[PDB]
Amino acid sequence: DIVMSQSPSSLAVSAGEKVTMSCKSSQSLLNSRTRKNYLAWYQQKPGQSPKVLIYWASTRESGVPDRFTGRGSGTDFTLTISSVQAEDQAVYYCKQAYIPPLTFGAGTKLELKRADAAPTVSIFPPSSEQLTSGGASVVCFLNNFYPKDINVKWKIDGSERQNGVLNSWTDQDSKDSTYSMSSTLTLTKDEYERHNSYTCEATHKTSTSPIVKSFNRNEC
Amino acid sequence: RRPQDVKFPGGGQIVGGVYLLPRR
Amino acid sequence: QIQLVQSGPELKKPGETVKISCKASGYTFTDFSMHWVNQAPGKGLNWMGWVNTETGEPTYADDFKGRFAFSLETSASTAYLQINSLKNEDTATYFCARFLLRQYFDVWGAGTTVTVSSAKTTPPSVYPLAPGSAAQTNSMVTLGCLVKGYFPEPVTVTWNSGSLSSGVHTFPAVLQSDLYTLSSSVTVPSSTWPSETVTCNVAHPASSTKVDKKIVPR
Amino acid sequence: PKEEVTIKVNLIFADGKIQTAEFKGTFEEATAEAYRYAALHAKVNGEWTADLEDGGNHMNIKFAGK
């Protein structure tokens, strides 16, 4: 019953800044009996299971870093991370219990900002192994970089192939507030065994001029 | 190690509300 | 410390039935009832319901009426969750957590990665990524390990059975034609490598695999 | 009917700091969601002088930090 919704739906603060995201119930949460608002907030970073940070809306759990802050009562709740450490690259939800059934909020997204920095392109060929069979895959890597918007374009012999490519963007890194992504150009052994210049041009923002990393079959 | 506690009183009496003393 | 453990992920085909677990060890199982939280992919958390770890009764929420059942063999400390007639939308990751009186969840699980689809479970292929047969030499670097064509998820690449942790960008899968493909990349110092055996580790829970493939030089 | 689009926004602050947030929902609730949060941070960091652009889809909520 208690509609729930948090806000904003993202946040891109910066190292050492204070954040204020919302979570506003629907139909009271101050339970008279108790004198406590049965609001609770949870932080689920990518992959771990969520972790609650505060209870009774305002109460900080045994373990939680003094720097997280749950205010709110009745129907207007707020969570605040001053000097937002990076690690904090998480997502925050909140829930109510004052009335079953339980409900979380869509969740408020907390991304991070920071110094910009081009990528680290590494290009890799179809491993001996794989080469044995119908398809080769070349792999390139754009390791650690701020911010998310980068690009890529392959080239099969001085020629951009936009067929058969597979890119996989990662989650904002773990300890620098960055990002990296993977493009896995793949091609039939033959389709591969034809041309010979394999290059990996990946455009970003860090430079008007792209980072070029190539690979000519005829040297391996 | 020595097994936890946190077992305390209460037990499990009506979720859709609390359960910790509504005094007379 | 205190922990709850769930059966591993599980794959199933439109219409089956399934049973996940949640064995806890660190607290008097029956002295806190266990709840189940759901979570689709990239979506939010839905409150399944919970089992009175005593009364041994269940309360489902509306959206889990029927089909979804809860149970627990109060003994071997493990509270079940069972489903019936799965649907495509039934795909999602599951959870169980301890819920105290305070009104929150102090410890949950790792969750069950359960997914429901036809597609035939099919073992993955691991490949290595040593940089060129020849090239430059600075301080740092990268090695690969592209993990092609598999299904269903999930997969776990790690490096040297552990050892290498940062340096790794084990990326996220992709679905192009009823099969998953996925990479991961590391980075050591040219001094170390290749003078020191870098073996990436990939396992695919589903075909009970565990290929550990040594990034050998070119 | 109703779609459910998002609101690109910039949250300038007085001191020259710039944070960034997204508000998604029915343009009413959507927008509504951003001002009832802009009207916020104020009870400690100044007042506000927003300014929509691009079909309103972008807003620059300024902050006097008074």
Short mmCIF file of C-alpha atoms in Angstrom, two decimals:
data_model
loop_
_atom_site.label_atom_id
_atom_site.label_comp_id
_atom_site.label_asym_id
_atom_site.label_seq_id
_atom_site.Cartn_x
_atom_site.Cartn_y
_atom_site.Cartn_z
CA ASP A 1 0.00 0.00 0.00
CA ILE A 2 2.49 2.66 1.09
CA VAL A 3 3.50 4.02 -2.44
CA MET A 4 7.12 4.67 -2.37
CA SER A 5 9.44 6.66 -4.42
CA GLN A 6 12.86 8.12 -3.95
CA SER A 7 14.63 11.04 -5.50
CA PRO A 8 16.39 12.03 -7.38
CA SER A 9 16.77 8.90 -9.67
CA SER A 10 20.76 9.54 -10.11
CA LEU A 11 23.36 11.74 -8.75
CA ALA A 12 26.78 12.46 -9.99
CA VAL A 13 28.56 14.07 -7.09
CA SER A 14 32.31 14.58 -6.59
CA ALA A 15 34.97 13.55 -4.21
CA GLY A 16 34.52 15.03 -0.89
CA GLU A 17 31.04 16.67 -1.55
CA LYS A 18 27.72 16.22 0.39
CA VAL A 19 24.78 14.62 -1.10
CA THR A 20 21.09 14.76 -0.38
CA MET A 21 18.81 12.22 -1.91
CA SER A 22 15.08 11.67 -1.02
CA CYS A 23 12.50 9.01 -0.06
CA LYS A 24 9.06 10.01 0.64
CA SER A 25 6.49 7.53 1.92
CA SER A 26 2.74 7.64 1.17
CA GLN A 27 0.69 7.22 4.22
CA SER A 28 2.65 7.96 7.58
CA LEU A 29 5.43 6.03 9.06
CA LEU A 30 5.66 7.39 12.63
CA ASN A 31 4.17 4.57 14.52
CA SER A 32 2.66 5.99 17.67
CA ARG A 33 3.31 2.94 19.68
CA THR A 34 6.90 3.24 19.24
CA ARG A 35 7.91 6.75 18.58
CA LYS A 36 10.06 5.55 15.87
CA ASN A 37 9.68 5.99 12.10
CA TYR A 38 10.03 2.58 10.58
CA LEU A 39 11.94 3.76 7.62
CA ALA A 40 15.09 2.04 6.57
CA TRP A 41 17.68 2.65 4.06
CA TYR A 42 19.80 0.26 1.94
CA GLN A 43 22.87 0.54 -0.10
CA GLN A 44 23.44 -2.12 -2.77
CA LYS A 45 26.62 -1.65 -4.65
CA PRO A 46 26.82 -3.62 -7.87
CA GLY A 47 26.61 -7.24 -7.12
CA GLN A 48 26.84 -7.51 -3.26
CA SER A 49 23.28 -7.80 -1.65
CA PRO A 50 21.87 -4.60 -0.42
CA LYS A 51 23.12 -3.36 3.15
CA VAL A 52 21.17 -1.30 5.37
CA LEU A 53 22.70 1.89 6.55
CA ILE A 54 20.20 3.37 8.85
CA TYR A 55 17.09 2.30 10.79
CA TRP A 56 14.22 4.22 12.64
CA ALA A 57 15.03 6.55 9.96
CA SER A 58 17.62 8.22 11.64
CA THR A 59 19.61 5.54 13.51
CA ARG A 60 22.95 4.43 12.13
CA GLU A 61 23.81 0.76 12.38
CA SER A 62 26.77 -0.78 14.10
CA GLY A 63 29.28 -0.77 11.39
CA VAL A 64 28.08 1.99 9.22
CA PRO A 65 30.42 4.80 8.59
CA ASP A 66 29.66 7.80 10.73
CA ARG A 67 29.33 9.65 7.44
CA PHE A 68 26.15 8.51 6.23
CA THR A 69 23.01 10.32 7.55
CA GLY A 70 19.32 9.33 7.76
CA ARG A 71 16.99 12.05 8.61
CA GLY A 72 13.25 12.27 7.97
CA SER A 73 10.05 11.44 10.02
CA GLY A 74 6.41 11.10 9.38
CA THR A 75 6.67 11.45 5.46
CA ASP A 76 9.76 13.35 4.32
CA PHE A 77 13.08 11.39 4.55
CA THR A 78 16.61 12.18 3.47
CA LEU A 79 20.00 10.40 3.22
CA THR A 80 23.33 12.26 3.30
CA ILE A 81 26.90 11.41 2.54
CA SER A 82 29.30 14.17 3.18
CA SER A 83 32.68 13.83 1.69
CA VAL A 84 31.33 11.01 -0.45
CA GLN A 85 34.08 8.52 -0.79
CA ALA A 86 34.29 6.70 -4.07
CA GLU A 87 33.63 3.45 -2.79
CA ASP A 88 30.29 4.78 -2.17
CA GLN A 89 29.52 4.10 -5.82
CA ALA A 90 26.44 2.58 -5.03
CA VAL A 91 22.80 2.58 -5.34
CA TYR A 92 20.37 3.63 -2.46
CA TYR A 93 16.81 2.39 -1.68
CA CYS A 94 14.59 2.77 1.18
CA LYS A 95 11.78 0.77 2.70
CA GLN A 96 8.93 1.00 4.98
CA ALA A 97 7.51 -1.60 7.51
CA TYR A 98 5.04 0.56 9.28
CA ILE A 99 2.52 -1.38 7.09
CA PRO A 100 2.93 -4.77 5.34
CA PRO A 101 3.63 -5.35 2.87
CA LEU A 102 7.04 -4.07 2.76
CA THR A 103 8.02 -1.56 0.05
CA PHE A 104 11.40 -0.20 -1.18
CA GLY A 105 11.82 2.85 -3.36
CA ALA A 106 12.80 2.75 -6.97
CA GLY A 107 15.93 3.63 -5.80
CA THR A 108 18.25 6.62 -6.09
CA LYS A 109 21.27 6.28 -8.17
CA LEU A 110 24.65 7.59 -7.01
CA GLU A 111 27.30 7.85 -9.58
CA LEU A 112 30.54 9.84 -9.18
CA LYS A 113 32.47 12.39 -10.95
CA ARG A 114 36.11 13.16 -11.04
CA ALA A 115 39.20 14.18 -13.25
CA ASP A 116 38.92 13.29 -16.62
CA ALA A 117 41.43 10.70 -18.35
CA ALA A 118 41.71 9.04 -21.66
CA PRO A 119 41.63 5.37 -21.90
CA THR A 120 44.17 2.62 -22.08
CA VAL A 121 43.55 0.72 -25.43
CA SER A 122 44.98 -2.69 -25.59
CA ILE A 123 44.35 -4.87 -28.69
CA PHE A 124 44.36 -8.46 -28.75
CA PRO A 125 44.16 -11.21 -31.47
CA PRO A 126 42.52 -14.45 -31.89
CA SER A 127 44.33 -16.87 -29.66
CA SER A 128 45.94 -19.81 -31.19
CA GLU A 129 43.41 -21.87 -29.58
CA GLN A 130 40.25 -20.30 -30.79
CA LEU A 131 41.77 -19.71 -34.19
CA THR A 132 40.89 -23.41 -34.43
CA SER A 133 37.34 -23.08 -35.66
CA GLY A 134 34.69 -21.09 -37.61
CA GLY A 135 35.15 -17.54 -36.28
CA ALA A 136 38.08 -15.39 -34.76
CA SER A 137 37.69 -12.79 -32.36
CA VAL A 138 39.85 -9.94 -31.89
CA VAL A 139 39.67 -8.12 -28.55
CA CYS A 140 40.29 -4.55 -27.53
CA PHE A 141 40.45 -2.97 -24.27
CA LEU A 142 39.69 0.68 -23.12
CA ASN A 143 40.60 0.32 -19.55
CA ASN A 144 39.98 2.74 -16.81
CA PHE A 145 38.66 6.17 -17.91
CA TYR A 146 36.52 9.11 -16.86
CA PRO A 147 33.81 9.83 -18.33
CA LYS A 148 31.48 6.97 -19.57
CA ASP A 149 30.95 8.45 -23.18
CA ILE A 150 33.67 6.98 -25.30
CA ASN A 151 33.48 5.16 -28.64
CA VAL A 152 34.92 2.62 -30.74
CA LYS A 153 35.30 1.72 -34.40
CA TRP A 154 37.22 -1.26 -35.84
CA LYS A 155 38.85 -1.53 -39.05
CA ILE A 156 39.43 -4.60 -41.21
CA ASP A 157 42.20 -3.47 -43.19
CA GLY A 158 41.84 0.41 -43.28
CA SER A 159 38.14 -0.16 -43.34
CA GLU A 160 35.52 0.39 -40.58
CA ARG A 161 33.45 -2.89 -40.13
CA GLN A 162 30.38 -2.21 -38.23
CA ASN A 163 29.26 -5.85 -38.42
CA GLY A 164 29.96 -8.44 -35.71
CA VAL A 165 31.14 -6.25 -33.03
CA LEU A 166 30.21 -6.55 -29.33
CA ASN A 167 30.83 -3.89 -26.85
CA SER A 168 30.36 -4.37 -22.95
CA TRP A 169 30.54 -1.37 -20.76
CA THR A 170 31.52 -1.91 -17.31
CA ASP A 171 30.13 -0.37 -13.90
CA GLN A 172 31.85 2.55 -12.55
CA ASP A 173 35.07 1.24 -11.16
CA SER A 174 35.83 0.21 -7.76
CA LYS A 175 38.51 2.70 -6.39
CA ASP A 176 38.99 5.57 -8.90
CA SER A 177 35.59 6.55 -10.19
CA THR A 178 36.21 5.34 -13.69
CA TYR A 179 34.99 3.31 -16.44
CA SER A 180 36.37 0.83 -19.22
CA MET A 181 34.60 -1.16 -22.05
CA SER A 182 34.83 -4.15 -24.21
CA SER A 183 34.43 -4.46 -27.92
CA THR A 184 34.73 -8.10 -29.26
CA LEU A 185 34.91 -8.05 -33.00
CA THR A 186 34.37 -11.45 -34.24
CA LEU A 187 34.66 -13.12 -37.78
CA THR A 188 34.78 -16.36 -39.45
CA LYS A 189 38.17 -17.86 -39.69
CA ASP A 190 38.37 -17.31 -43.35
CA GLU A 191 36.50 -13.71 -43.20
CA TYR A 192 39.63 -13.32 -40.98
CA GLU A 193 42.00 -15.24 -42.57
CA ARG A 194 41.45 -12.63 -45.62
CA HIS A 195 42.44 -9.16 -44.70
CA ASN A 196 45.69 -8.42 -42.47
CA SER A 197 45.45 -4.81 -40.68
CA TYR A 198 43.72 -4.98 -37.39
CA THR A 199 43.26 -1.82 -35.64
CA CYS A 200 41.30 -0.49 -32.74
CA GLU A 201 40.33 3.13 -32.92
CA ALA A 202 38.51 4.21 -29.81
CA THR A 203 37.24 7.94 -29.63
CA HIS A 204 36.67 9.61 -26.28
CA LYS A 205 36.97 13.32 -25.22
CA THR A 206 40.24 13.49 -23.69
CA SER A 207 41.71 14.26 -27.13
CA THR A 208 40.42 15.56 -30.46
CA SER A 209 42.61 12.95 -31.79
CA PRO A 210 41.81 9.21 -30.99
CA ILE A 211 43.78 6.59 -29.47
CA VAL A 212 44.97 4.23 -32.18
CA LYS A 213 46.04 0.61 -31.51
CA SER A 214 46.52 -1.69 -34.38
CA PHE A 215 47.62 -5.35 -35.02
CA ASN A 216 48.87 -6.91 -38.53
CA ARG A 217 48.15 -10.52 -38.61
CA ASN A 218 51.47 -11.01 -40.69
CA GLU A 219 53.75 -10.46 -37.53
CA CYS A 220 52.45 -12.87 -34.92
CA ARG B 1 33.79 -18.47 19.72
CA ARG B 2 30.72 -17.86 22.27
CA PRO B 3 27.27 -18.06 20.41
CA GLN B 4 25.56 -14.84 19.89
CA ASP B 5 22.59 -13.27 21.84
CA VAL B 6 20.21 -10.57 20.30
CA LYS B 7 17.49 -13.11 21.29
CA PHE B 8 16.11 -10.90 23.85
CA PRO B 9 12.24 -10.85 24.57
CA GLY B 10 9.44 -10.06 22.11
CA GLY B 11 9.33 -13.38 19.79
CA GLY B 12 7.07 -12.91 16.78
CA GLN B 13 3.59 -11.00 17.45
CA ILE B 14 2.07 -9.12 14.55
CA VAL B 15 4.37 -7.73 12.05
CA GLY B 16 1.94 -5.00 10.68
CA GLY B 17 2.89 -2.96 13.55
CA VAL B 18 5.65 -3.22 16.34
CA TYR B 19 5.90 -5.43 19.37
CA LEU B 20 7.93 -3.85 22.18
CA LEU B 21 5.61 -2.53 25.08
CA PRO B 22 2.48 -0.29 24.65
CA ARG B 23 2.26 0.48 28.45
CA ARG B 24 -0.81 0.61 30.52
CA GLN C 1 30.84 -13.86 11.49
CA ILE C 2 26.93 -14.51 10.82
CA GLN C 3 25.79 -15.70 7.45
CA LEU C 4 23.08 -17.09 5.38
CA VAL C 5 23.78 -19.25 2.37
CA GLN C 6 21.79 -19.91 -0.75
CA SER C 7 21.90 -22.70 -3.06
CA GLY C 8 23.66 -21.80 -6.27
CA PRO C 9 22.03 -20.32 -9.38
CA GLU C 10 19.79 -22.55 -11.31
CA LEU C 11 18.43 -22.71 -14.89
CA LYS C 12 14.91 -23.80 -15.91
CA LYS C 13 12.67 -23.96 -18.85
CA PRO C 14 9.29 -22.28 -19.30
CA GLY C 15 6.96 -24.18 -17.08
CA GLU C 16 9.05 -25.96 -14.54
CA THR C 17 9.23 -25.96 -10.87
CA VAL C 18 12.20 -24.92 -8.66
CA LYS C 19 13.74 -24.95 -5.16
CA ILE C 20 16.43 -22.69 -3.81
CA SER C 21 17.82 -22.64 -0.34
CA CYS C 22 19.07 -20.47 2.36
CA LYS C 23 21.14 -22.18 5.06
CA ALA C 24 22.11 -19.99 7.86
CA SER C 25 24.84 -20.33 10.22
CA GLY C 26 25.69 -17.68 13.04
CA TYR C 27 22.36 -17.29 14.87
CA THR C 28 19.62 -19.46 16.37
CA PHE C 29 17.92 -19.96 13.15
CA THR C 30 14.59 -19.99 14.87
CA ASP C 31 14.88 -16.96 16.65
CA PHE C 32 14.40 -14.49 13.69
CA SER C 33 12.12 -15.17 10.82
CA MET C 34 13.48 -15.27 7.36
CA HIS C 35 12.31 -13.10 4.52
CA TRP C 36 12.83 -13.40 0.72
CA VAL C 37 13.61 -10.26 -1.38
CA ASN C 38 13.49 -10.47 -5.22
CA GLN C 39 15.24 -8.44 -7.80
CA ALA C 40 14.92 -8.64 -11.57
CA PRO C 41 17.67 -7.68 -13.71
CA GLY C 42 18.55 -3.99 -13.32
CA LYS C 43 15.38 -3.55 -11.72
CA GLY C 44 14.36 -2.96 -8.06
CA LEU C 45 13.69 -5.07 -4.97
CA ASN C 46 10.22 -6.72 -4.42
CA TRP C 47 9.32 -8.03 -1.07
CA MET C 48 8.45 -11.78 -1.63
CA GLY C 49 7.15 -12.33 1.83
CA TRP C 50 8.46 -14.23 4.81
CA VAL C 51 8.27 -17.48 7.12
CA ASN C 52 7.59 -17.30 10.63
CA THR C 53 10.86 -19.28 11.72
CA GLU C 54 8.60 -20.75 14.38
CA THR C 55 5.11 -20.62 13.71
CA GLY C 56 6.58 -22.11 10.46
CA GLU C 57 3.89 -20.29 8.47
CA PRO C 58 4.26 -18.12 5.42
CA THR C 59 2.94 -14.81 4.39
CA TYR C 60 3.16 -14.17 0.65
CA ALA C 61 2.56 -10.63 -0.78
CA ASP C 62 -0.07 -10.12 -3.42
CA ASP C 63 2.15 -10.38 -6.35
CA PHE C 64 3.36 -13.90 -5.01
CA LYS C 65 0.11 -15.42 -4.45
CA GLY C 66 0.22 -19.00 -5.53
CA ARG C 67 2.89 -20.47 -7.34
CA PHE C 68 5.38 -19.13 -4.83
CA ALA C 69 5.68 -20.99 -1.73
CA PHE C 70 7.75 -20.88 1.38
CA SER C 71 8.92 -23.60 3.67
CA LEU C 72 11.82 -24.48 6.12
CA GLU C 73 13.09 -27.71 7.71
CA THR C 74 13.61 -25.80 10.92
CA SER C 75 16.50 -28.18 11.62
CA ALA C 76 19.31 -28.21 9.17
CA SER C 77 18.90 -24.36 9.46
CA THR C 78 17.75 -23.55 5.89
CA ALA C 79 14.62 -21.90 4.80
CA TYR C 80 13.21 -22.81 1.28
CA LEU C 81 11.68 -21.03 -1.39
CA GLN C 82 9.90 -23.00 -4.13
CA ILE C 83 8.26 -21.92 -7.32
CA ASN C 84 5.85 -23.44 -9.84
CA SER C 85 5.11 -22.97 -13.40
CA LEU C 86 7.99 -20.52 -14.15
CA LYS C 87 7.50 -17.97 -16.72
CA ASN C 88 10.02 -15.87 -18.76
CA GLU C 89 9.28 -13.06 -16.33
CA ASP C 90 9.88 -15.26 -13.60
CA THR C 91 13.57 -14.63 -14.33
CA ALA C 92 15.01 -12.80 -11.73
CA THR C 93 17.69 -12.93 -8.71
CA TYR C 94 16.45 -13.95 -5.30
CA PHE C 95 17.31 -13.39 -1.65
CA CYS C 96 16.72 -14.23 1.93
CA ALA C 97 17.67 -12.08 4.90
CA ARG C 98 17.42 -11.88 8.54
CA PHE C 99 14.78 -9.45 9.84
CA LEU C 100 14.87 -8.26 13.17
CA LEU C 101 12.28 -6.28 15.32
CA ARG C 102 13.98 -3.12 14.66
CA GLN C 103 12.40 -3.45 11.13
CA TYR C 104 15.32 -3.94 8.70
CA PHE C 105 17.76 -6.49 7.27
CA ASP C 106 20.99 -6.91 8.82
CA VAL C 107 22.19 -9.84 6.84
CA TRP C 108 20.83 -11.04 3.67
CA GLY C 109 22.18 -13.72 1.11
CA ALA C 110 24.14 -13.83 -1.77
CA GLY C 111 20.90 -14.62 -3.64
CA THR C 112 19.93 -17.15 -6.34
CA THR C 113 20.69 -16.19 -9.72
CA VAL C 114 17.72 -18.46 -11.14
CA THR C 115 16.74 -17.76 -14.68
CA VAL C 116 14.03 -19.41 -16.82
CA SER C 117 14.42 -20.28 -20.51
CA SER C 118 14.49 -22.82 -23.10
CA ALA C 119 17.91 -22.71 -24.57
CA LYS C 120 20.23 -25.49 -24.17
CA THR C 121 22.73 -25.29 -21.38
CA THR C 122 25.87 -24.98 -23.19
CA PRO C 123 29.57 -24.86 -21.76
CA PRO C 124 31.75 -21.94 -22.38
CA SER C 125 34.98 -21.49 -24.18
CA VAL C 126 37.98 -19.70 -22.78
CA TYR C 127 40.57 -18.02 -24.66
CA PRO C 128 43.62 -16.22 -23.83
CA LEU C 129 44.81 -12.62 -24.34
CA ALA C 130 48.66 -12.06 -24.44
CA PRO C 131 49.53 -9.02 -26.15
CA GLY C 132 51.23 -9.22 -29.47
CA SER C 133 53.82 -11.57 -30.59
CA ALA C 134 55.97 -8.44 -30.22
CA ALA C 135 55.85 -4.84 -29.13
CA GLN C 136 56.69 -2.16 -26.56
CA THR C 137 57.46 -2.39 -22.79
CA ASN C 138 56.47 0.29 -20.06
CA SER C 139 55.79 -0.42 -16.54
CA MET C 140 52.16 -1.74 -16.38
CA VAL C 141 50.20 -3.77 -18.99
CA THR C 142 47.19 -6.24 -19.63
CA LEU C 143 46.34 -9.83 -20.16
CA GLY C 144 43.14 -11.33 -21.34
CA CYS C 145 40.83 -14.30 -20.98
CA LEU C 146 37.61 -13.94 -23.53
CA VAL C 147 35.09 -16.21 -22.49
CA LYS C 148 32.93 -17.00 -25.54
CA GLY C 149 29.61 -18.85 -26.29
CA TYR C 150 27.99 -20.21 -23.12
CA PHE C 151 24.68 -20.35 -21.37
CA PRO C 152 22.97 -19.66 -19.13
CA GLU C 153 24.66 -17.24 -16.64
CA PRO C 154 26.26 -16.93 -14.67
CA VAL C 155 30.26 -17.15 -15.04
CA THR C 156 33.12 -16.21 -12.84
CA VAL C 157 36.60 -15.20 -13.93
CA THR C 158 39.07 -14.64 -11.20
CA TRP C 159 42.99 -14.54 -11.46
CA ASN C 160 45.36 -17.09 -9.89
CA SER C 161 42.81 -18.59 -7.75
CA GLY C 162 42.63 -15.28 -6.18
CA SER C 163 45.93 -13.50 -6.07
CA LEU C 164 45.32 -10.78 -8.62
CA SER C 165 42.38 -8.68 -7.71
CA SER C 166 42.81 -5.14 -9.00
CA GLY C 167 44.00 -4.90 -12.31
CA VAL C 168 40.87 -6.85 -13.38
CA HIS C 169 37.94 -5.64 -15.39
CA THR C 170 36.03 -8.70 -15.76
CA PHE C 171 33.30 -7.31 -17.93
CA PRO C 172 29.53 -8.04 -18.42
CA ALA C 173 28.06 -10.78 -20.78
CA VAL C 174 26.24 -10.34 -23.80
CA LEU C 175 23.44 -12.16 -25.45
CA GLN C 176 23.81 -12.49 -29.30
CA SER C 177 21.99 -15.72 -30.35
CA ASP C 178 20.95 -17.87 -27.48
CA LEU C 179 24.56 -17.79 -26.11
CA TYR C 180 26.63 -15.60 -23.90
CA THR C 181 29.93 -14.14 -24.55
CA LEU C 182 32.29 -12.28 -21.95
CA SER C 183 35.72 -11.07 -21.29
CA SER C 184 37.91 -9.90 -18.43
CA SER C 185 41.29 -8.29 -18.34
CA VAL C 186 44.01 -7.84 -15.96
CA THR C 187 47.24 -5.87 -15.68
CA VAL C 188 50.59 -6.66 -14.13
CA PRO C 189 54.03 -5.36 -14.39
CA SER C 190 56.13 -6.50 -17.29
CA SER C 191 58.82 -7.40 -14.76
CA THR C 192 56.66 -9.95 -13.15
CA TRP C 193 55.16 -11.34 -16.46
CA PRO C 194 55.63 -13.58 -18.07
CA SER C 195 58.30 -14.68 -15.42
CA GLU C 196 55.50 -15.63 -13.31
CA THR C 197 52.64 -17.89 -14.40
CA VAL C 198 49.27 -15.77 -14.84
CA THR C 199 46.50 -18.07 -14.93
CA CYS C 200 42.99 -16.71 -15.27
CA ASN C 201 40.18 -18.70 -13.77
CA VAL C 202 36.79 -19.13 -15.35
CA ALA C 203 33.99 -21.36 -14.13
CA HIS C 204 30.56 -21.81 -15.31
CA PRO C 205 28.53 -22.92 -12.68
CA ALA C 206 25.98 -24.44 -15.05
CA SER C 207 28.02 -27.18 -16.77
CA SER C 208 29.78 -27.84 -13.55
CA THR C 209 33.03 -26.39 -15.37
CA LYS C 210 36.25 -24.68 -14.18
CA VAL C 211 38.65 -24.00 -16.90
CA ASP C 212 42.00 -22.33 -15.50
CA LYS C 213 43.86 -21.22 -18.49
CA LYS C 214 47.39 -19.76 -18.24
CA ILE C 215 48.01 -16.71 -20.14
CA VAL C 216 51.05 -18.11 -22.08
CA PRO C 217 53.10 -15.46 -24.10
CA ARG C 218 53.03 -15.36 -27.75
CA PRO D 1 -2.12 7.80 -21.70
CA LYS D 2 1.30 9.25 -20.44
CA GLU D 3 4.87 8.15 -21.47
CA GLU D 4 7.71 8.31 -18.70
CA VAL D 5 10.72 10.37 -19.67
CA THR D 6 13.54 11.63 -17.89
CA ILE D 7 14.95 15.22 -16.90
CA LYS D 8 18.52 16.07 -17.47
CA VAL D 9 19.62 18.60 -14.82
CA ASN D 10 22.56 20.47 -13.41
CA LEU D 11 22.76 21.60 -9.81
CA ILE D 12 25.10 24.56 -9.57
CA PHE D 13 25.94 25.76 -6.31
CA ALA D 14 27.01 28.92 -4.98
CA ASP D 15 30.68 28.16 -4.26
CA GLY D 16 31.16 26.95 -7.83
CA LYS D 17 30.56 23.37 -7.22
CA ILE D 18 28.45 21.35 -9.73
CA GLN D 19 26.73 18.16 -8.98
CA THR D 20 24.52 16.24 -11.42
CA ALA D 21 21.14 14.42 -11.08
CA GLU D 22 18.30 12.80 -13.21
CA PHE D 23 14.57 12.95 -12.56
CA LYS D 24 12.36 10.53 -14.33
CA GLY D 25 8.44 10.34 -14.49
CA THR D 26 5.27 11.97 -15.86
CA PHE D 27 6.57 15.39 -16.93
CA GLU D 28 4.18 16.89 -14.29
CA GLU D 29 5.57 14.43 -11.42
CA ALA D 30 8.71 14.39 -13.11
CA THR D 31 9.26 18.04 -12.97
CA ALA D 32 7.31 18.38 -9.94
CA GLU D 33 9.82 15.72 -8.40
CA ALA D 34 12.87 18.10 -9.34
CA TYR D 35 11.47 21.33 -7.86
CA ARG D 36 10.27 19.79 -4.72
CA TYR D 37 14.01 18.72 -4.36
CA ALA D 38 15.46 21.98 -5.72
CA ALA D 39 13.33 23.86 -3.09
CA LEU D 40 15.63 21.53 -1.11
CA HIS D 41 19.23 21.61 -0.06
CA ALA D 42 18.09 25.26 0.56
CA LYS D 43 17.37 24.61 4.39
CA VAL D 44 21.13 24.75 4.76
CA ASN D 45 22.62 25.79 1.24
CA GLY D 46 20.97 28.80 -0.24
CA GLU D 47 18.00 29.60 -2.46
CA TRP D 48 17.19 28.78 -6.00
CA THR D 49 16.71 30.16 -9.35
CA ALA D 50 16.13 27.35 -11.74
CA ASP D 51 15.74 27.74 -15.71
CA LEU D 52 14.44 25.20 -17.98
CA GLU D 53 15.72 24.59 -21.63
CA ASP D 54 15.14 22.05 -24.52
CA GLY D 55 11.50 21.48 -24.12
CA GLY D 56 12.14 22.01 -20.35
CA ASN D 57 14.06 18.47 -20.48
CA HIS D 58 17.11 20.34 -19.16
CA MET D 59 17.20 22.59 -16.13
CA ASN D 60 20.07 24.25 -14.38
CA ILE D 61 18.81 24.70 -10.76
CA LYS D 62 21.27 27.51 -9.43
CA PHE D 63 21.97 28.00 -5.83
CA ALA D 64 22.71 31.18 -3.94
CA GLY D 65 23.99 29.32 -0.91
CA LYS D 66 22.75 32.04 1.13
#
